[PDB]
Amino acid sequence: EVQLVQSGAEVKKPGASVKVSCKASGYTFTDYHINWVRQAPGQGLEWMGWIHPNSGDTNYAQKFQGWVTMTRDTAISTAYMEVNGLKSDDTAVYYCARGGLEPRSVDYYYYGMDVWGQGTTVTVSSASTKGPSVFPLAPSGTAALGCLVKDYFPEPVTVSWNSGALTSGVHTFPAVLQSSGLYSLSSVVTVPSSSLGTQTYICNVNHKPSNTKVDKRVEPK
Amino acid sequence: SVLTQPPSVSVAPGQTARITCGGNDIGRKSVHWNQQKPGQAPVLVVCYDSDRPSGIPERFSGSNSGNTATLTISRVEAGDEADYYCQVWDSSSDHVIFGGGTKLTVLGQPKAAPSVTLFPPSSEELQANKATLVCLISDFYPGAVTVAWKADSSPVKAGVETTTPSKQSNNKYAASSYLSLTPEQWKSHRSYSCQVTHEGSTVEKTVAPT
Amino acid sequence: KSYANNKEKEVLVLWGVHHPPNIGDQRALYHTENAYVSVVSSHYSRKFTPEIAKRPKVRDREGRINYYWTLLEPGDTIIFEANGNLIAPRYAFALSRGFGSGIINSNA
Amino acid sequence: KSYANNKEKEVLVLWGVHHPPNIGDQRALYHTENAYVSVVSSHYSRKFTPEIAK
């Protein structure tokens, strides 16, 4: 079964470079093109180029001419995409593709893209790993009760209530990317108004990139 | 060159979903179509205008002619809600070109109004000389909402960071908007308000210092 | 490739040369931008350097194929060589001559 | 350059190709020592590699 397995996520600062890998299995790696296409957050697909593993011949798109270098190896059935002079707008997901749709006519003699890799997420931000500042969101039958996980970088961060004891009624919203390049999010739990004062509620925030672990009692004001 | 593809398309189940891929002499170029569900990689569904790779339901097909190609999904289901892209190869520039993509929205449940919960700045956050107001939005369908902050009826645009809507467990959507500001601004008004507009219906929540 | 005529008659051989409308088609089809086709016999020897030429759509085709033929007398050998753009012969015609006739263009 | 005949009649087109006597003239006039001229129509297609000839 044909399969393309790509390398892992990358976080870089502007000016750095990356080299993404695409290892193929299930077919003779030399019969078909390896295309490279990226997708920035929220926007559409942008074709970057192809390289044919057998000949080494390359086709680069115009925007990506010079900034990019596509290579192969053939012995390990792998293709490489090297990007240089990175910039915040180069943040995207890099997919590889197999040009296995053999053409049917010499009128449109194009090897279309059969199989895709799972993607390689490349984040380009001038921000340095920073842990969150955690603040209690105090309550107004049941209450509203939460925690603010403010100013951290990069994703991800996890929130659990009473160390996992509370699980139903937990709603943890996805993070907002501030203009500053830092993230923030919030997590609220619905809970009976009577337990307040008798039950103690805590949020467990874990940001592993900065190795930050925080616990906050959320008490009434 | 360019491939014009309508940003959004709305359709009900059991119907026939029809999507456009615009371009010049695209009828002699043989289009290909990709499906991308959120969080996943693209997948080939229609190849060579009308055909399919192995494993695709027969209700995926299409047509191509003149200056317009079209992808056709018969007997629409809910699992077909995704972003669709058309692709051609321009021999002139020797490029592979995609369309802008289309969001296929399958209407599989009624309209829902958003629930909004608004939190003031905490004592800690103020005690560190900062303030943030937390407006939390949940349980609305069509994942399309507009948020507007107000300080004593006077709107507020600067210092306001809002997310995009995201599906939650129950297939409704949810978003959140944060309004950062100073303690002095916090106490210069007796209240702030978060206004969440959804399909015309506006819901509001206010908060006041203590 | 080569064919040696052992049929004791003349062998009519036909071929073509493809002139694409764009360089993308050239690369996609043949993987060279500097293409040559050589056809050699003792009584015919010609060489081809087909260059891209975008042409008005005829049968909806901006590109062309130039058609070429020759007679290969018995004993002689024809040799084709190419790195692209060749429309090789598949069937040839072993014929004896005849003489002095013409063609008629009528609906009778 | 290209011209499309829209005059419903045949268009007689004429041109030339310059063969300089020295290579200095070639460089001064055209700034290449490897020169080509291609003329293409459906019924006429020829290519030129004019070389110096004193």
Next chain:
Amino acid sequence: RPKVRDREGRINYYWTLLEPGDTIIFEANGNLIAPRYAFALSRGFGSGIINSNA
């Protein structure tokens, strides 16, 4: 090429007339079979060749 007189290679033969005053120029880096003797002739007109053993 197939052996003709036991030779896989060939020589293509070429000729031309050089009218008075005009100059002919050869240039080559190889494969030339230069002229040694040429034939200064006046024309004559309108005859043919005979192929017989008489």
